[model samples]
Target chain A: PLMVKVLDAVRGSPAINVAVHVFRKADTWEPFASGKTSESGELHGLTTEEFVEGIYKVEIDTKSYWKALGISPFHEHAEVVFTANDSGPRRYTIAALLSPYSYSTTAVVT
Target chain B: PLMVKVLDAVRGSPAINVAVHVFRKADTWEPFASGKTSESGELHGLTTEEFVEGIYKVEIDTKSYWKALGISPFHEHAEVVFTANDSGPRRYTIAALLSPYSYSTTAVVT
Candidate 1:
């Protein structure tokens, strides 16, 4: 299964309610999945089916998130684009850290 | 001025000795500065002068870093591309987290 975890660097806590979107690239990007982070800053079971081999883009709606907090932010959004399942089926986790003007992301695959 | 900090997700500590390259976008990408993360997983004083207004790219040599640790990483390198000091001169921090198969980066501007 594919999952996502986000943390708030400024608050030093989990970033809840941030919107997340996943897209698969063909001739163009096609929407594959979407969700919002939970109270624990995690979104799980993005897809019950197995993942296909292809390039994927994960977009976080960072602007809306910061706007909700009454703060102006730099980036309109944060994006992580990568190839998935290159070798074979793997468990994937996308971890992200967010501040008002900065965000970091990492992936764990097993 | 610009700075960088890297953390190792797998080991839950600072990622030291990770090579960082900074490029300014002109007609092409021009080498601006380069350094390696110190023991604290941070690189400072990339340039003694203030950052100029333009596009910049920060390349983190993650594959080489993971290779040095006897692991094969997924990405050749992790890149953060953004427009710097668009409004005015601002301090920038590029923070990254790395795992064997995944990496995340965020920017802090002040």
Candidate 2:
């Protein structure tokens, strides 16, 4: 149960509040959850249980949401590391490709 | 022959003069080549010919070299769209993941 779907790659629109986190990579990184997206930018189910395989990261605050919309974000945050296969697919879907300056990410796991 | 190396994904170093560009996704975009990167960040043989498989991009200029090194670049530019398959593999290696805030990319076709 992970979702996420921000957009706006050159104004395709839908990238509301943004700000999502969700780490869990070992040795040091370990944030577990936090959220904000919907308005059309989606972000359902963002982990509340189950997901025990390995590596993960989402991070995307995108320079304080483009400096509170004054804009000027080339990146100040926007990570999306991957690899989480609790035996493969359970419900994961990712896609963030915004653009205040640039960004990209994609994930899928049925 | 397309190679890029740029680094500095959190001080791994080597991002030199950055600035690279190569487009060719038709309909409008058609820049062919341009460069800047050496000093360690590499960028050899950036096309003088060969490569007609479709969709491409590699724009990096990261906010004018992080505002000429005074720094403060969230991403005024740094793209790396890909997909060039002339039946697969010829010599294409890529890896750009710098950070004034964030950036990432990876490609390989040897």
Candidate 3:
């Protein structure tokens, strides 16, 4: 399973309803899942291919969300690439910190 | 010559005093020059390697600025790369638009 959260650094609030896509970096980079963050800017309980071990890319649709709020986003989107080495039902939590001109991510076990 | 401007999309202010670095994508990716933006969030009159034609990268220091403002920046910095094909005296302008979770840049001839 996986848990991902999005936080707005400027407003210091959870970015709610932000669309995101998870892609497995395969020969062609196939997308495995797509969804939106909750009210708490979190999306969890993601289990793909029985926890396949490979590189995965999580892309956030920041442009649309900010545009809907009448804000102009700088980057088209944000992404994080991580390797899923551990197998099983292990839960991984990833937090994304977003600023007007910056973004960072970290992975932790929950 | 090159002109680069950094703008804050959140507060719609010019990001002044931002540190920036220019690097050439060479055999080892060598850094060529560094400077700070003025009050208008712009750095101009940058003539590097006689306006060589290649892939050049401009990296902005966003972390330090937001930190000085007592705000947390998500990404470490922002950057842009464009092909310099024309020779002789020419002026180019690049603008960076920054948001908490997004960044975008565009290039134009001035």
Candidate 4:
């Protein structure tokens, strides 16, 4: 399964209600899954089916997140692109930190 | 001026000796500055002069960093690309968290 967690660095809290989109790269990028973060700034079970070995992209809708707070941000979105399941099936977590002008992301795989 | 900070999520500590490179986009990407993270996981004084308004890319050499620790990482490197000083001069901080398979980054502007 795949999971996403977002944190608000300015407020030092979870970034709730942020939209997340997942894509798989074929000849071109194909949309695979999408979800909005919960109150804990986490979205789980992006897909019920198991993942295959491939390259994936996670797009975080950061602009809307800050706009909702009445602030204009810099980047239109934050992107995390990586390869997955190269060797075997693994649980993956993408964690991100958000600020008005910048954001960070990391991944945990097991 | 620009600054960078790096943290190791697996060990919950600063990521020292991680190579960081800065690039400015003109006709193409040009090297602006480069350095390695200090013991405190921070790199300051990347440039003696102030940064002008432009698009910039911060590349963290994650592969070398993990390799030094006897671990093979996923991505070749992590990149943070964003516009700077669109409005006016500002202080920028690019903070990143590194894991064997993933990494995250955020920026603080003041």
Among these predicted structures, which one has the highest TM-score?
A: 1
Candidates 1 and 4 compared: the better one by DockQ is: 1
Per-residue alpha-carbon lDDT of model 1 for A1-110, expressed as tens digits?
Answer: 68988877776466889999999998799999999999988998788545788898999888898899998999998998989888987777788888887777777665
| Model 3 per-residue lDDT tens digits across residues B1-110 | 77788877665567889899988788666887788999878998667556777778889888787888887878898878766655645466676767767776655453
What tens digits encode model 4's per-residue C-alpha lDDT throughout A1-110? 78998889986567999999999998799998999999988999898545788999999999999999999999999999999889988788898888898776777665
> Residue B53 in model 4: shift from native, Å?
43
DockQ of 2: 0.01
Task: Evaluate residue B43 in candidate 2 and report its C-alpha lDDT on the 0 to 100 scale.
Answer: 83
Task: Compose the digit string of candidate 3's lDDT tens values, residues A82-106.
Answer: 8776554445666676766677665
- The ten-residue window of minimal lDDT in model 3 chain A covers A85-94
**Alpha-carbon lDDT, every model:** 0.85, 0.75, 0.75, 0.87
* Per-residue lDDT over B27-104 for candidate 2, one digit per residue giving the tens place of the 0 to 100 score: 678998888898777888888446768888888887887788788877788788777875864666666667788777
Clashing pairs in 2: A74-B74, A74-B75, A75-B74
Would you list the rank order by TM-score, best first? 1, 4, 3, 2
Model 3: per-residue Cα lDDT at residue B17 = 94
Ten residues in a row with the worst lDDT in model 1 chain B? B101-110
Question: How do the residues B1-110 of candidate 1 rate in per-residue lDDT, one tens digit apiece?
Answer: 78998889987567899999999999799999999999888999898654789899999999999999999889999999999888988777788888898876766565
Candidate 4 stretches greater than 4 Å from native? B1-110
Query: Which of 2 and 3 is ahead in lDDT?
Result: 3
Off by over 4 Å in 3: A86-89, B1-110
Per-model chain B TM-scores are 0.96, 0.32, 0.86, 0.95
